[PDB]
Design an enzyme around this catalytic site. Structure first.
Site, PDB file in Angstrom:
ATOM      1  N   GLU A  35       0.800  -1.221   0.000  1.00  0.00           N
ATOM      2  CA  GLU A  35       0.000   0.000   0.000  1.00  0.00           C
ATOM      3  C   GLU A  35       0.840   1.282   0.000  1.00  0.00           C
ATOM      4  O   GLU A  35       0.607   2.192  -0.804  1.00  0.00           O
ATOM      5  CB  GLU A  35      -0.959   0.033   1.194  1.00  0.00           C
ATOM      6  CG  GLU A  35      -2.091  -0.998   1.158  1.00  0.00           C
ATOM      7  CD  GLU A  35      -3.083  -0.813   0.025  1.00  0.00           C
ATOM      8  OE1 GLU A  35      -3.136   0.284  -0.571  1.00  0.00           O
ATOM      9  OE2 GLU A  35      -3.832  -1.759  -0.270  1.00  0.00           O
ATOM     10  N   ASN A  46      -7.544   9.629  -5.941  1.00  0.00           N
ATOM     11  CA  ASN A  46      -8.240   8.779  -6.897  1.00  0.00           C
ATOM     12  C   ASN A  46      -9.148   9.689  -7.730  1.00  0.00           C
ATOM     13  O   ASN A  46     -10.280  10.005  -7.323  1.00  0.00           O
ATOM     14  CB  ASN A  46      -9.059   7.738  -6.148  1.00  0.00           C
ATOM     15  CG  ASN A  46      -8.203   6.890  -5.218  1.00  0.00           C
ATOM     16  OD1 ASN A  46      -7.350   6.125  -5.675  1.00  0.00           O
ATOM     17  ND2 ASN A  46      -8.387   7.056  -3.913  1.00  0.00           N
ATOM     18  N   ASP A  49     -13.092   8.997  -8.512  1.00  0.00           N
ATOM     19  CA  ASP A  49     -14.211   9.202  -7.594  1.00  0.00           C
ATOM     20  C   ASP A  49     -14.022  10.319  -6.574  1.00  0.00           C
ATOM     21  O   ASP A  49     -14.814  10.453  -5.646  1.00  0.00           O
ATOM     22  CB  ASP A  49     -14.591   7.894  -6.901  1.00  0.00           C
ATOM     23  CG  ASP A  49     -13.642   7.517  -5.768  1.00  0.00           C
ATOM     24  OD1 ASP A  49     -12.493   7.985  -5.722  1.00  0.00           O
ATOM     25  OD2 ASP A  49     -14.074   6.741  -4.909  1.00  0.00           O
ATOM     26  N   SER A  51     -11.820  10.671  -4.177  1.00  0.00           N
ATOM     27  CA  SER A  51     -11.423  10.285  -2.834  1.00  0.00           C
ATOM     28  C   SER A  51      -9.902  10.207  -2.799  1.00  0.00           C
ATOM     29  O   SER A  51      -9.261  10.157  -3.840  1.00  0.00           O
ATOM     30  CB  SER A  51     -12.022   8.919  -2.453  1.00  0.00           C
ATOM     31  OG  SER A  51     -11.447   7.863  -3.209  1.00  0.00           O
ATOM     32  N   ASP A  53      -6.522   8.227  -0.607  1.00  0.00           N
ATOM     33  CA  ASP A  53      -6.033   7.168   0.277  1.00  0.00           C
ATOM     34  C   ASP A  53      -4.942   7.811   1.119  1.00  0.00           C
ATOM     35  O   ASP A  53      -4.073   8.482   0.575  1.00  0.00           O
ATOM     36  CB  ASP A  53      -5.457   6.033  -0.556  1.00  0.00           C
ATOM     37  CG  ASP A  53      -6.501   5.396  -1.449  1.00  0.00           C
ATOM     38  OD1 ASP A  53      -7.650   5.256  -0.992  1.00  0.00           O
ATOM     39  OD2 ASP A  53      -6.179   5.057  -2.604  1.00  0.00           O
ATOM     40  N   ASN A  60      -9.000   4.901   2.810  1.00  0.00           N
ATOM     41  CA  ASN A  60      -9.846   5.759   1.990  1.00  0.00           C
ATOM     42  C   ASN A  60     -10.766   6.769   2.703  1.00  0.00           C
ATOM     43  O   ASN A  60     -11.469   6.436   3.668  1.00  0.00           O
ATOM     44  CB  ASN A  60     -10.658   4.898   1.020  1.00  0.00           C
ATOM     45  CG  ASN A  60     -11.216   5.697  -0.133  1.00  0.00           C
ATOM     46  OD1 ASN A  60     -12.363   6.110  -0.094  1.00  0.00           O
ATOM     47  ND2 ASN A  60     -10.413   5.908  -1.167  1.00  0.00           N
TER      48      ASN A  60
END
Ligand SMILES: [Cl-]
Ligand SMILES: [Cl-]
Ligand code: NA
Length: 130
Positions: A35, A46, A49, A51, A53, A60
């Protein structure tokens, strides 16, 4: 902060991650590795959408933390996303625990399915004294 492998292994064990909700320490290590590369300040927007991380586990903003700019988002960990960018990973671990408390468990992270599921993950904790 960029953690060294064994340093992180010992830290997660102390924070009670070994076997949390049936998830072994080596799986948590595999997840953190893919990750963020054990990097606490890693962020990933991202575009698809809107959002982002955040941190070592790449949690998220749509469901787990609040950053205020994510559309239709909830804050299940009841944390500002800023908390997941600290060097001290206590808040990030408490939030990761909340994520796996949902039915999907460790499967919530697609990266875990791709790089950790059904693999020999022992290498992540070998020689660490955990
Ligand atoms: Cl907070
Ligand atoms: Cl907040
Ligand atoms: Na949110």
């Amino acid at each position: 902060k960029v953690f060294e492998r064994c340093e992180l292994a010992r830290t997660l064990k102390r924070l009670g991650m070994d076997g949390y909700r049936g998830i072994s320490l080596a799986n948590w290590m595999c997840l953190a590795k893919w990750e963020s590369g054990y990097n606490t300040r890693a962020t990933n927007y991202n575009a698809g959408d809107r959002s982002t991380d955040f941190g070592i586990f790449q949690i998220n903003s749509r469901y787990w933390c609040n950053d205020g700019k994510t559309p239709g988002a909830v804050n299940a960990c009841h944390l500002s996303c800023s908390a997941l960018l600290q060097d001290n990973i206590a808040d990030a671990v408490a939030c990761a625990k909340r994520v796996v408390r949902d039915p999907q468990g460790i499967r919530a992270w697609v990266a875990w399915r791709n790089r950790c599921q059904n693999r020999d993950v022992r290498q992540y904790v070998q020689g660490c004294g955990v």
